[PDB]
Amino acid sequence: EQNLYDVGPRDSGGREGPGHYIAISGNTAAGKTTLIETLAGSLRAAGADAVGVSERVFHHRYLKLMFSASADFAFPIQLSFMLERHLLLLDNLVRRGRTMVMERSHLDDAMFVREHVASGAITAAQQRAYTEVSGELNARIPNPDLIVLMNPEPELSLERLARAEAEGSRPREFPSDAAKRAWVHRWYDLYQELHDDYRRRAVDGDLRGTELLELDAAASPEEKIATVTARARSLVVG
């Protein structure tokens, strides 16, 4: 539908350079997928060669082993998230000049490695190797142009996840109810810190030139799309 994996030649008319890059950043079950699908379609309607990319597009077949056998599979599955995200950005955003609406940015993945390092599932030496590769990959990808900061409270995430799992609309990914609850909580705390770092990064760090937009994860989906569209519409190029 969106031609995400085309190895053919660029086709951007006379426009040069990468497309523009919108990232929706926050913990699981915030409403990001819902927002991304609508936003990508709205940008296409405005004339942009835009695509919306949820991580489920590139989830590894071995995903569940990261959560059931983390000291064995957290390191390579985290490498997978990084690498598959990178390749989609390198091709769609950079090579082909398309506009990207993505679940998370390439800057979010390092926080998920930090969680496994803190728990002991990934070693410090493994993290150092990850970071070396991450730095080389990230150097080839432009910063996001708009980061939407939408971090849900843990009990909100878990309420939404429990309903979806119970209705069969999403798979159960964790080895126990407690493992799901605990990862959601540890990720929430790390996301609060990551977003505070992003706020400083955009002023005094390497994200100068990037716009940040705060969004309450408890807002209605229609309020979320209205709020994000009011900033994303400015980024449309034909």
Add this chain to the structure above:
Amino acid sequence: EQNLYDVGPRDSGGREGPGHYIAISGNTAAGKTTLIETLAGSLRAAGADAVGVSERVFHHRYLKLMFSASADFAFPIQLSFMLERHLLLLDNLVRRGRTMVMERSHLDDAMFVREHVASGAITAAQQRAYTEVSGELNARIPNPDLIVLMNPEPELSLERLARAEAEGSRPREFPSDAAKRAWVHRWYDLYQELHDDYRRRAVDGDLRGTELLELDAAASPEEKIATVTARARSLVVG
């Protein structure tokens, strides 16, 4: 058919530890796929929980961009080969104790990065990052137990490739006839060196305990399977 991506629990009866690991190592169009499919079935007939894995199982959707835009995609596509191979070994061979017959070993991939570094498509800093990750990943995978050294001459590889591409039985992966010819030749030279290194590694290096088996790539398929079976049959465990 072979249940390669099962995230469920191990089921090896009373047998502990990894399965056994047979790798077929040599340049493209040697006859490895042909041999691997038959060998895996023969080992299953003998009572082993064996699988045969060709790289085409885990080829990235972006493979062709490694050869048409190498200074942009060689690094992440080489990371993909490494990582997807690693995950299949970590799950099937180690976690689940299955016996593996694989196209190449995890020790072969570094030579493909060396080719891109020599040409300039991968930078020295990119290669250093690759090697750091490669070392951490390889430390979790047992050495191959039997390495079959089967390196075809370049014109033999190219004859077989041209016939398959002409008949539509394999896709054209390269941006030109010359690019195909040149990569095949550079890989051939590097494989001659890699195999000489393996021969020394198995005596004075970290492959002590591993068996090597020489096989002429020009031999008939039935001679190849007879020759490899005569050594692989000894590795069967129930």
